[PDB]
Design a protein around this ligand. Sequence first.
Ligand SMILES: CS(=O)(=O)Cc1nc2ccccc2[nH]1
Length: 165
Amino acid sequence: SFSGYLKLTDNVYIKNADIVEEAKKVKPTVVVNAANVYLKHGGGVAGALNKATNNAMQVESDDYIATNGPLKVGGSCVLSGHNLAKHCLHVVGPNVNKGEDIQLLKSAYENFNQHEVLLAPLLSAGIFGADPIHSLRVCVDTVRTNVYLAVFDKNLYDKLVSSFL
Ligand SMILES: CS(=O)(=O)Cc1nc2ccccc2[nH]1
């Protein structure tokens, strides 16, 4: 199962790890992708997860968008986890670099409550432009299910743990 995670709360855990390497090792029931509304997995966590699936995630995602149209900012969809997990929960946090409403971050984390346990990144952090300290706070105050957070950046991981209230 999950190993080397620091316990932050009753249900939130955190580790300095590459979420792709964590997914390949654990093969969790659910891996969360930091998706955009189009499911275009170009960079950040999305690009890295998609590359690990040999682009199968993108092919499946393009079929999903062709059928359903785009997701909402704050929304999600469940697709296959391919070689990484049973399922991938594609969650759209607001991208502050694209001017999206940061209040939608709580709505984005509410999607995690539909799954008992998830391997996840901090939503809207990294290339999405939001403050990761704020994202962790919203995560702990919103998610009630078991979430194992993988933070790629060591320096950010140390800052998140040391500043956690
Ligand atoms: C696995 S990779 O694509 O070679 C490198 C990588 N790993 C990441 C984890 C989180 C965000 C971006 C990331 N880029």
